[PDB]
Structures are given as C-alpha cells and as structure tokens.
Amino acid sequence: YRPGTVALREIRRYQKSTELLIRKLPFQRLVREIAQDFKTDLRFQSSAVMALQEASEAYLVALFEDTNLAAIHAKRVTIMPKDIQLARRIRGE
Amino acid sequence: HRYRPGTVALREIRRYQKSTELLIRKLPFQRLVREIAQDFKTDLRFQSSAVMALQEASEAYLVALFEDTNLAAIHAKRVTIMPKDIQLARRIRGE
Amino acid sequence: VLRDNIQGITKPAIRRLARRGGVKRISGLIYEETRGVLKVFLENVIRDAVTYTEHAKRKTVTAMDVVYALKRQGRTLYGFGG
Amino acid sequence: AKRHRKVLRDNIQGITKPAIRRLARRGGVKRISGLIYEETRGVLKVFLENVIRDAVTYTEHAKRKTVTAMDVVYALKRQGRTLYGFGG
Amino acid sequence: RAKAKTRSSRAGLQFPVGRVHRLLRKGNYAERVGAGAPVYLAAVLEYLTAEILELAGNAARDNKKTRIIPRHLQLAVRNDEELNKLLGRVTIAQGGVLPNIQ
Amino acid sequence: RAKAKTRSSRAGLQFPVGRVHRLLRKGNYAERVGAGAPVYLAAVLEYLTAEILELAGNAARDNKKTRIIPRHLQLAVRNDEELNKLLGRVTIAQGGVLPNIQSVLLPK
Amino acid sequence: YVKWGKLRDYQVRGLNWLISLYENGINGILADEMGLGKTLQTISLLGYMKHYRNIPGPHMVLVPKSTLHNWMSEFKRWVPTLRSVCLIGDKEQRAAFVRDVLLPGEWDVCVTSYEMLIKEKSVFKKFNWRYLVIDEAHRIKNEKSKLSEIVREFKTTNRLLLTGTPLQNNLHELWSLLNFLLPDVFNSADDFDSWFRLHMVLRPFLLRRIKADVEKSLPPKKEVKIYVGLSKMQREWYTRILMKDIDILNSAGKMDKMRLLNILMQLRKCCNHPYLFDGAEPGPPYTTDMHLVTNSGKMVVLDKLLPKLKEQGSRVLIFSQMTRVLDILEDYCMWRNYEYCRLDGQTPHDERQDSINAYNEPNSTKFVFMLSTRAGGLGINLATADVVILYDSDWNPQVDLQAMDRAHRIGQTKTVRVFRFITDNTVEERIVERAEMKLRLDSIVI
Amino acid sequence: KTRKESYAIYVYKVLKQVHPDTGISSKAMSIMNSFVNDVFERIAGEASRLAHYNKRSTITSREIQTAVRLLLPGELAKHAVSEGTKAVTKYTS
Amino acid sequence: RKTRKESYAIYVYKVLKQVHPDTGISSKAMSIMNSFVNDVFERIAGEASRLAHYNKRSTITSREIQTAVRLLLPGELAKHAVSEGTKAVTKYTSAK
DNA sequence: GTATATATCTGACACGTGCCTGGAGACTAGGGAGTAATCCCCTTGGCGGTTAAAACGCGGGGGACAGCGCGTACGTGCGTTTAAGCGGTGCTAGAGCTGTCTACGACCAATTGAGCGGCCTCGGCACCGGGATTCTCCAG
DNA sequence: CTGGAGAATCCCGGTGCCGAGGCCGCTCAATTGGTCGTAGACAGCTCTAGCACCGCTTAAACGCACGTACGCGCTGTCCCCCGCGTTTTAACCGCCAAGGGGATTACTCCCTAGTCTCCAGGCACGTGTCAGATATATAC
Ligand SMILES: Nc1ncnc2c1ncn2[C@@H]1O[C@H](COP(=O)(O)OP(=O)(O)O)[C@@H](O)[C@H]1O
Ligand SMILES: [Mg+2]
C-alpha cells in the first residue's frame, strides 16, 4: 500500500473503538514513581489507577486535536513539537 | 519627510502599552450596551459605573484575544493578522 | 428604539486595541470580524446581568449585577465593589 | 553474564512509540514527526504530577495510606477535568 | 393517621422529592429550604435525564443493540448542540470520540 | 469583669480575627467552626496582603511617585510568577498591559 | 502383560487395590511415598483394561510439563501395547494435532500438560472419556481454581489422582480433592470438616506405603542443618531495610528512597545475597571474581563443593526458590570451572528432558545440579546424585520434602545427604520454624 | 453491613417510559448516576449564592428557577422551566 | 439613617505602613485591595468546606484550612503561608 | 466465490426474595418574609460651546503568496526478540466497623471600645509653557 | 558606508487644586463570663483486598531495511495596506430641571423547623437466562 493509505485505515479503526491504548503495567509503574516523591510507601486501589489512565488518555487525545489544527494552519500535514507548544500556550497552560 | 511603513506602528504599540486609559470612546459604547439590553427587557435604567464595569471587561477581553491571534500569525510565518487567526485562537481556547 | 450602534465601534478604536495587544499590521477584514466577536461577548454578559436584576425586582442594572455576571463566566474583575 | 542478561529502562519509556501513535490516530493525526515522542512524554509527566500531588493531599488529610478512586476524582474535578463513571 | 402518599406521586414525577429535600437541607446551601424548591428541582433533574436517554436509546437502535452502553451516551451528548454545551468540560469513561477526519 | 484584649492582639496580627469568625459562621461553610480557624485564616490573609503591597511600593518608588495607584499593582502581580499563577484569571481596573513586543516584529 | 521388567511385590499389590476400585465403583487416591514408582502402576492399569476387560476407550493423563517426556517414555518401555498421543505446542501445531491425530480416533490415551487443556478445553469436552488420571494433584487443591472447574466438566466413567503428598495446608484442601473424585461421598466442605477419626475415613479411598517398609534395601537419608552468619554488606543492607532508609537511586536525584511495602520479602532477598539488591554490587565494571564468595555467608560456606568434587564423585543438588539466586550460582560456578546443569520455568520443554538424561547417564562429567523448586522440583527423577544442598527454605514444608526426594527414589544405593543453609538469627529462622509447624499436623502417617 | 444510595432505580423507571424495549449496562448506569449528582450540585450552588447576594435566609422555587435560567443553554432552559412550573402547580393542587 | 459599609481598608493601611513607612495608596488601589482580600477569603473557605463534607465531619478547623491553603496556593507561597498561620495559632493558644 | 451467516456458549442483567431505617403524619414554635409608606440620591434629556477625533482621499513599498527545485526523513513491512497478560500462592498492611468517654463550641446575657461616618486642608503632583538631546531618515 | 537635517519624547522650573490624611463624634458589634449538650479522639476488634514471588502463553514491540511523500529555502510576483494631509463631524466639557425609583423604617402574620412517632420504599441478597460474543458448521 502507498504511504498514508494504512494511516487513514488506522485512524478510522481507533476512532470507532472505545478501548484504552496504553499498556496497563507500564503505566502503573509510572504512577507509582511519581507519587513516591510526594509521600512514601503509599498503596493504591485497583480502580484508582484506571481513573488516572482514563483521564490521561482523554487529555492526550484532546491535545492531539488542537495540535493538528495548528499544523494545518501552517499549511502542513505533519505535526511537530512547535504545534504542541502553541496549543498549550493558547489554552493558557 | 515620511517615516517608513511600520515605524509609527511601533511607537503606537509602546505608547498604548504604557497608558491605562480606555481606548474605545465612552458615549458610543454606552449606546451599544443599551441597544443590546432591549432584547432582554424594556425600559432598564443603568448605573453609570455599571457601564464602566462593562467597558473595562470588554477592552480587557479584546486586547487578550489579539495577543493569542498574533501568535497564530507568527506561527504561520506572517506578520499580518487575518480572520482565520481569530477563528483558530477562539477554537483552540474552547469558545 | 435604538438603531445599529455597532458601527460606533470605529476602525481607529479597534486599531488601538490591536496595538495594546502588540499587533504591528492588520488586515482589512478584521474589523467586521471583531465587531461580531465583541457583540457575542456583550450579549452573554448582559443577558446574565439582567437575570440578576430581575430576580431582585429592580429596574436599574447595578455595577454588582455586572460583576456577578462576569464572575460566573470565569472573568473576575477587581475595582467595582466585588 | 547470567546475573545480567536483562536491562531496565526508565519508567517514562514504558509509554512506547507504538502507544503514542495510536492516541494521535484517535485524534485524527495522519503523519507525525520524530521528536514528538520526547515532547509527549514531558507533557504527560507534568499532567500526572499535578493530578497526583492533589490526590495525595486528600489522602493525607483523611489519614489513610491507600489512594482511592474518589481521591483521583476530586483532584480532577478541582482542576476542571470532571470524570464520570468512577463514582461521585 | 391517613395512609401515606409519596410527594413525588403528588407532583407527578418519578424522581425522589423526599431525598432531594434532605440533600438540600444537609448540604449547607441555605439556613432554610422552601416546600416547592425540592419539587421544582426533581422535575428539572428528571427532564434532563429523559433528554439524554431518548438520544442514547436512538444511538443504541441505529447500532442494532438493545442495551445502552457508555459509547452510545457519548454519541448522544456530542451530537446535540445544547447537551455538548452543558457537558463541555466532562470526560465520559469508555466513551469514544465522534468520528471526524479533516 | 476584666479588661478586654481583641483576639488579633493575642495572636499578634493586624487583620481582624473577630470579623473573620463572623463571616465564616454566617457564610454557610459548615455546621460548626473552631476557634483556631479564624486565627489561621487571618494570618494567611495578612501575609498575602503584605506580599503584594511590598512589591507595589517598590514599583511606586521606581516610578518616583509617593502613592500606590492601580497600575503599580498590575506591574507587581504580573512580574511575579506565583502571584501571576494565583491571579491568572483576574482583570484589574485601570491596569495596563506589561510592555512587550514579539522579537519577530522588531526592525532589523 | 508388562514387558521390560517385573514389578516389585508392592507394585503388584497396588494394581489389585486399584482394580478393586473400578469393580467397586469408587475412585480414590493412591499415595505411596514420592519416587516409589507410582507411574508404572498406572500404566499397568490402563493395560489391564486393554488386555483383560477389553475397554480401549480414550483415557486422560494430566502431568506437569516437565514430566511429559518421561510419561511418554514410560508407557512405551514397560507396556508397548497401548498406543498413546500427547499434546504440546504453539497455536498452529496444536490445531494440526487436533485435526490430523486427536479427532481421527487413532489412539487410546491422551497425555497433556495442565496448561494446554485450559487453552483447548472444547475439543476435549467433545469426547467422552473412560479414565481421568491426574498426576501431581496438588495443582487443584483450591476448590475455585480455573483448572479445577474445567477438569470437573469433562465426561468420565472413573477417576484416579496420584499424589505423593496427600496433605499440603489444611483440611479444606483435602475436601477439595475428595469432591472431584467422589462428589457424591463428599457434598460439602463443611460436612467433611467438623465431623473430622484419623485413618477411618481415609482407609477405603486412600492407600499409603512408606519406602522404609516396602524397600528395605534403600539407604536411609541424612538430615543436617548449616546455620550461617551474615556477611558485612548484608548486615548494613539488612539494617537499612528495616529502617526504611535504603535511599539508593540509580538516576542521581539525591538517592531517592526505595519502596518497601512488603518487608519480609526484602530481607529474605538479602539474606540470600546482597548482590540481588541493585547498587550494592560494587562499581560500574563489576567482574570482580572473588568478591562474590565473601560477600554472602551462604556462599562462603559453599566452598564445600570443592571437597566433594575431589571426595569421590558424590554428586550434589542445589535447589532454590528464586531465579536470581540461581543466576549468581551459575556465574560463580563458571569462575571455579565445575561441571553444571540448570532447569527453570523459563526453559523450553524439549531441553528439559535432555538435561535430565545427560546428568543421569551412568558415567557423566556433570557434578552439580541447580533446580527451581517450582519448575523442576516436582516429578522429574534424578537418582545418580547423592547430596542435597538447599540454598533457601520454603513456607510449606511439602514443597521442600519433594525436592529432597528427586534423588532418593528406587535405584539409589548411596546415602542421600541433606543440608540446608539457614541464617541463625533472622526472619529466615521464622520461615523455617513455620514450615515445621505445618508438618506436625501431617506427621508422615503410615 | 452498609447501604449505598443511588439514583439507579429512578433512571430505570424513566428509561422504560422513553424506550420500553431497551435495557442498560452497569457501566452506563454508573455514568448516569454521576450526571444527576453533578447537575444537582450546580443548581444548588447558584441558588445559594443568589440568596446571599439579595440577603435572604431561604432557598425557594424562585431561586431555583433563576439558577436554571443562569445554568442551562436556551432551548433546555425554556423546557426545564416549563417542566418545573407544571410540577409545582400540580403539587400545590 | 445612611447605613454603614464594612471594608478591609484600615487593616490594609496599617500593613502598608509596616512595610513601607512613607508610602501611600489612592482610593482606587484601595478598592482593588478590598476586592483581592474578599476573593481569597471565598476561595479558601469554599475548599475548607468541601474537604469536611468529603470526610463527613461537621466542623471546620485549622487542619482543614491548612489543607485548603496547600491545595490553592502556588508552591513557595504555600510554604511561607503555612508557617505564618501555624505561628499565629501557637502564639494565640499561649495567650487565650 | 468467500466473508459474512450460519451457528453456540456464558458472564452480566434482571427477576424476585427477605430484610430494616429514612420518608411521611401531624401538630406548635417563633422567627423571616411581605407589603405600606416615607424620604430625597441619582438618573434621565435640555441647551450651547468648541475643542479634538474621525473621516475622507490617495502616493507608494511593504508583506502575502504561488511556484519551482532539492534532498533526508517518515512510513512501510520483514523477521526477530521481548515481556504484557493471564493463572497460582503466599501472606498480613491497614480500610472498616463499633464501642466508649469527655474536650470542645454554641448559646445566652451583659458589657464597653474599635470602627464608622462626618466634616477638613495643607501638600501630592496634573498641568501649562520654557529648552535638551536624540530618536530616525536620506542624499549625498 | 554615513553627515546631516529636523520631528520625537524627553527634563526642567512655575503655576494652582481638589485628592488624601487628619480628627471629631458616637455609633453598635466584639468582648467576657457562664452554661449547655454532643462532635469527634481513642481503643479495640474483624477480615477485605493489596503486595511479592513464580508460571504460562503468545500478542506485542523491537530493530532492520527499503523508497518516495512531502519538509521547507529562493524566487518572482503585483496587490492593499501604511502614512500623510486634508476636511469634516460629533465628542467632550459645563451648565441647570424634572421626577423615576434606591432606599429607609414600620407594621403585620404566613411560613418552615422542631419534635416524636410510625410503617413501606429501597437496600443487598442470590439466582437464570439471555444479549452478545464468538463458536459451528454451511453454502453457493
Ligand atoms: N518394578 C520396577 N523395576 C525397576 N525399576 C522401577 C520399577 N518401578 C519403578 N522403577 C523406577 O523407579 C522410578 C520410580 O519413579 P516414578 O515412576 O516417577 O514414581 P513417582 O511418580 O512416584 O515419582 C522410575 O524412574 C522407574 O524407572
Ligand atoms: Mg513422576
């Protein structure tokens, strides 16, 4: 298939599905490291890490929409680090 | 004599970025506010400071939107603001 | 009944607001676009400011009615008795 | 050596490039630059720091050692990130 | 004493007037609560409940399902211009993204 | 009856402890309110007040003027990262914009 | 019918008990001491049915993954007449065996690991089975384990469990095994319990026979305990673990702090070796050849291998409960240049049997075997060796007894020596004490 | 040994008036309980503030009507006010 | 007849004179300081109220205010503030 | 002519059971609330005056924008190695409940001083009109 | 490249002014004291679920190489702002009038909270069958 033919096919699949896209063990290990710096030896509910993963993946998907409109405004189809930075600046964060 | 295109634009930026005056003229804005109010209720009267509170809030909003709009045009490698730059800024803000 | 005063927001006054915002050069169609943006903002603030006055059973819009309307929309304003 | 066949990455690296590409595909991104994987990790880490710090403040106030689902939901709500489904 | 009738039955509503009154009395909103305040509020919450479930049930039907699931709810909220303004800052779990490619 | 000593004098504060307690009691924040709560809150309100007025006073002396005015307050809040994070959604009346041009726009 | 060798008298006696149960309509569990040749007795049972009662219906043998090549060999050698088929493989290979072998009905015995069953329970459910024999039946001691249920579903005329260790933890477990066999005779756990009487309930359905009475010729085993003291790196680490101030962070950051939610585990990883804990090993280069022996008290005492390699060829085993320990032992052995072998649960099936055999050869160069108690301490047979060192101790005492019996089995003619590294004044002492308390209830009943 | 109140039975009684044939999942019913809790807290927060600004001790239906008008978008507000006023008239009869 | 209106102005002045003795403040800058004190009072009191409801307690206390301050204020401002408030309660409880 | 479409199990929903604690009855309590009426702050247009601001027009050079060519980087799929994911097993940290007992806060009445508005005025600094560099630009 | 001219704010010193700090008087909320009753700290107990090892299987990610979509530097292009001056209109300032309606206080009497008592909606509980989630054989 040509460059970008499979890229559109993936966009359609993932937009239809409602599943979590990051792996669960690799993400749980990151939540627990960040926390140890605030307080030590905490334990965690199994549902609390899933609330963090849902909230994280919702935040990143929404930021990738604003990044793609800031890329198309500059007449490109490729997203770049500067487009993420303009989106985060206009949102005030 | 003649200064060059854009030289007086810089003096105007500096002069208005030093002062704290209101820039829109007061009486014309008072007529605009009242006209809008008739769509919601007839024969409203108004405190004089309620119109000044509306003007202070309105000029603060427009100045801040023009800053976000300017960033977008520089991002697109231009120096002139365009209607699509106001539309991008409002859309990314969530308005 | 008042006629259209949105043309009373002049081209020179919109340009001074763009200058305080750091804008060096401006396209001609910004003015028509800016007047609609201002009108939509004022319609949202005045609508709520009047809902408050009506609840209070008063005919006069007060500075506090405006300050409460702005506070709801995430636009705190210091200076007017807040 | 047998003592050392396995080697460990940092925990940020667990968010893999394949994992970021799918998120951008759900967001409707067609082509993506190479430097975005480094940039995206930096951005998520700042998001997790701000949510977790508060979720732990709530836990300490309640005098508990376990972070609950409600501690996370209240922290997201206080920042304008309301979440439905996990109670409250 | 006479046999009990629920205040929701008197108002002609399915949501609970009694629970709503207790919630308001114990939530520290005002030092007093009126008698019509719980009835007006229960009517509004049931109306808003019905507006979402009507759109969600249509989305389940177009998808050939009998059972409403979290995806159907997202589709309903995000395709309605008033519900998406009411709910513009909430995240629904297991709620997908409306399909859109520029 | 012994001679009265206002609660702010007992805690060593300039802001009013007694008024803060009334405002909390009548403001629908809780069924009850403890006696150490108005003392803690009055101390924090006075610290945050002194934090602003210190930098405002310095902005007034930098402008060579003896009275603080509403612009001096804007120049203080905006030039400090934490006060600008605390007051990030606030408009101050008669407050100018900090002086600033993007370097792309300056002459060669 | 048996061909390769005659049976021992006890083994003949066993089949008589077994065949009575089929006639009786009861099922039961045979429980000779471990390594007494139960496998052969079962192969004979499946051949009685083909030769005398003429039932060739499909039967099932569930065996641990390690024992799959032994199970197969045994059937062929002793009773070549029965035909057998065995399942193991990836998804593709598994399907082909179903399509070209299992479904054509050209076989009378299926033998498969407990794992390949859960993976393909359906094809198994279709058939109707005559006998279901499960070797090593402690895998279904919990009433609710996934496998315990799937096993119960399949249709079956008669059932036999073979377990060396009837008792593992508490009576509820015994009820669980009794239910799968005689659901009618044991409707509920509560009933079995409370009513409790030793031997009376057990006699009809259980047959136990200890090696000492049946095989007098066997040399009796030696029990020894080596208490040890901690090295110095260990004394520091052990202390800092308890104090929760290990600090230690690879990526600078002022050393951060380690997370120690579960403390008993951390202290045990160090009582074995401090090298396990990251950053304790000295330096980026590593490769110091002698620091290992001296940095761990249990490894200092392991210099005993050198006397034994020279002290004739009394071969030794060094079992363990953690993989990392086994790693060290492998790099150390390489420095001394001894001859060694190692199994693990990570290793592939084909390799396992090879390494049981090279070592079991009559005159092999190999001297030490390193084997994880879970993966290799159940069901394999390794009789050539004569000494046992257990690097670590286990909570359940039966996990330990079994690893000790890999060597002591029929064919052993030299005393089996047992030696356990324990640390004298630490929580390791508690773990050992605890395992002993559980055995007391069992007491090796006759 | 501890009960947990929720709106679930009320959401189901309304569901069957709107769509007699359909059912609903447990995940979806948990989102529906969260919606009712969020909307309740919004309307009661504006009512409370309104009373305070006007110096009143009581929350009445007139404050809840105004809170609904401040919170809901225009087409929902006009219908929600119609449903509230119909209920209060019927209740008073 | 004409009713009184309360404000923070006399405390704001007394704190200015402690910080910069010779300086003053115009009436508009006073209106802005009076607005600031009321905004920050309402933010702290709203967070302190919720935290008690979450944990099912009916009393607001210095501990709930301390947590509210750590949630609302930026990082360094929070540290100094917390010290000022705990100092004031230590002095007050020595003299109640 | 092959991928649904026939075909087949199975945890999740939906039923009803038993159970128990918030909703509902029906009076007394005493304040908030509503409505009358009064007063006089502050609002709405009157005019004229006359500065400053907005408006118009249009010379001229800045930036917006299309196109070309160039070149390295992102996407593709291969085989490969990796460890997510799932079962099993051990254990005991610490959420949760109930129980008991006593420091705390709200309340009352009474009391008297910080803080309110009113009336005041000499000094901060807006404003005008004098000269100072010093921004920028252009034709030598 | 750069001297020169000539419009830009920029200091400087005088002139007047109603803003800000002072005080007065006296108002009405903070103070103290005593009392009441119940929020919440303590200890104890139970037992759910969180944390640590292994084992098992095979989706998944790893790195490799291949090749061409599209990133982005120059150029030419010729339109639309900028800035100037002009004329023009409507802003500002001040002055003075009528009367809407914010505000006060006063009166009266409907409203809701309180208490105790009571019995039916709603809680969790344990089954069951089906909606869906793929298995099972067809079918053309
Ligand atoms: N009758 C016999 N004659 C010779 N060797 C035997 C006999 N019975 C058993 N063995 C050998 O002794 C060992 C018994 O171990 P195994 O069959 O695995 O019994 P278990 O299952 O009880 O461990 C086997 O290796 C087998 O080769
Ligand atoms: Mg065996």
mmCIF file with all atom_site columns, C-alpha atoms (C1' of nucleotides) in Angstrom, chain G residues 91 94 115-116 262 323 345-346 352 374-375, chain K residues 51-59 136-137:
data_model
loop_
_atom_site.group_PDB
_atom_site.id
_atom_site.type_symbol
_atom_site.label_atom_id
_atom_site.label_alt_id
_atom_site.label_comp_id
_atom_site.label_asym_id
_atom_site.label_entity_id
_atom_site.label_seq_id
_atom_site.pdbx_PDB_ins_code
_atom_site.Cartn_x
_atom_site.Cartn_y
_atom_site.Cartn_z
_atom_site.occupancy
_atom_site.B_iso_or_equiv
_atom_site.pdbx_formal_charge
_atom_site.auth_seq_id
_atom_site.auth_comp_id
_atom_site.auth_asym_id
_atom_site.auth_atom_id
_atom_site.pdbx_PDB_model_num
ATOM 1  C CA    . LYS G 1 91  ? -1.415  -22.484 18.360 1.00 0.00 ? 91  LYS G CA    1
ATOM 2  C CA    . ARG G 1 94  ? -1.862  -27.631 18.399 1.00 0.00 ? 94  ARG G CA    1
ATOM 3  C CA    . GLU G 1 115 ? -1.912  -25.742 30.544 1.00 0.00 ? 115 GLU G CA    1
ATOM 4  C CA    . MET G 1 116 ? -2.673  -26.967 27.048 1.00 0.00 ? 116 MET G CA    1
ATOM 5  C CA    . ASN G 1 262 ? 6.315   -5.696  51.887 1.00 0.00 ? 262 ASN G CA    1
ATOM 6  C CA    . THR G 1 323 ? 15.646  -17.218 39.848 1.00 0.00 ? 323 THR G CA    1
ATOM 7  C CA    . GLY G 1 345 ? 10.321  -22.400 34.415 1.00 0.00 ? 345 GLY G CA    1
ATOM 8  C CA    . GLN G 1 346 ? 11.573  -20.155 31.659 1.00 0.00 ? 346 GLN G CA    1
ATOM 9  C CA    . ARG G 1 352 ? 14.247  -30.257 29.972 1.00 0.00 ? 352 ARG G CA    1
ATOM 10 C CA    . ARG G 1 374 ? 8.517   -24.959 41.449 1.00 0.00 ? 374 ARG G CA    1
ATOM 11 C CA    . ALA G 1 375 ? 9.631   -25.795 37.879 1.00 0.00 ? 375 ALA G CA    1
ATOM 12 C "C1'" . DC  K 2 51  ? 1.764   -6.585  47.562 1.00 0.00 ? 51  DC  K "C1'" 1
ATOM 13 C "C1'" . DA  K 2 52  ? 5.548   -10.110 46.442 1.00 0.00 ? 52  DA  K "C1'" 1
ATOM 14 C "C1'" . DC  K 2 53  ? 7.237   -14.075 44.248 1.00 0.00 ? 53  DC  K "C1'" 1
ATOM 15 C "C1'" . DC  K 2 54  ? 6.615   -17.613 40.414 1.00 0.00 ? 54  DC  K "C1'" 1
ATOM 16 C "C1'" . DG  K 2 55  ? 4.358   -19.990 35.712 1.00 0.00 ? 55  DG  K "C1'" 1
ATOM 17 C "C1'" . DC  K 2 56  ? 2.261   -19.931 31.419 1.00 0.00 ? 56  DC  K "C1'" 1
ATOM 18 C "C1'" . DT  K 2 57  ? 1.148   -18.367 26.632 1.00 0.00 ? 57  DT  K "C1'" 1
ATOM 19 C "C1'" . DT  K 2 58  ? 1.838   -15.695 22.544 1.00 0.00 ? 58  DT  K "C1'" 1
ATOM 20 C "C1'" . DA  K 2 59  ? 0.305   -10.510 21.423 1.00 0.00 ? 59  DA  K "C1'" 1
ATOM 21 C "C1'" . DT  K 2 136 ? -20.026 -24.282 14.265 1.00 0.00 ? 136 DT  K "C1'" 1
ATOM 22 C "C1'" . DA  K 2 137 ? -20.840 -25.900 10.672 1.00 0.00 ? 137 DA  K "C1'" 1
#
